[PDB]
Design a protein around this nucleic acid. Sequence first.
RNA 1: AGCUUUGCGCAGUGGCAGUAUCGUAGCCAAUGAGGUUUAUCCGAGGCGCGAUUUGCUAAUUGAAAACUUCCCAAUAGCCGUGACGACUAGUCGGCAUUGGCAAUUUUUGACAGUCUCGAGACUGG
Length: 156
Amino acid sequence: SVTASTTQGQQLSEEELERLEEACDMALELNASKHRIYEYVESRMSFIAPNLSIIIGASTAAKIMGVAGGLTNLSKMPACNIMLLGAQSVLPHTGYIYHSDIVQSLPPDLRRKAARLVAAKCTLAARVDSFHESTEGKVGYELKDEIERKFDKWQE
RNA sequence: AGCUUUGCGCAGUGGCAGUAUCGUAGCCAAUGAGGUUUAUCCGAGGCGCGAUUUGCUAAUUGAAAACUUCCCAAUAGCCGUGACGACUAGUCGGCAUUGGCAAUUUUUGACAGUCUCGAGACUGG
């Protein structure tokens, strides 16, 4: 309001205002579509791979389940490849679980090691939901408590 | 029967030893430590804290450097002299101590160097 009192800006057209209006309307369409996709992918990924979704987050769980080629290919991958799963001058030897929110929830030098912590345990989680045990996700909850317990252990 | 591999133990030669060798009871660690190289790859301990027995010998200071001393008194050659003694003023033997013992015959150095085949020669300017 303070800088709308002094804008130094000229008015738009009617075509310019309606062009910006439909641009903002399709932008809200893209935002609501993104959140609809997010809700569906978290629901169906908590059904398909509950423990991996609990550890990493179900969108990144779906990304590393897809680029590996499903759960039954994600299990028989080691922990040192699921770290680099989704890789490609921005950061090297990084996968989809380096740019996760739970691996960016810490200082920038605390990052790489944390990737190896989230890659290993979720690999266990991936193996745990390659067979259909722990459908409620208790292995994911226990391992995720272990993850952020180690994160709080490293932090001050 | 011989050869031989791997791990461990013992001893020995040699090498290394504070960017070395360990402890860790605190935490983490193959359910993955730690990764800038080659990363759909590698794979072992890591971070902190804390350390780096025993016998022998030398040397120094110190009065004393840790295994059951100093001090006084006396005892442990010959020419003269004094007595005692012996033998005829003289001689001899032993004992004793109240002066002396580097000037040719002795005990305060004619010795030292050299040369020749047990024996001699040369020099000491």
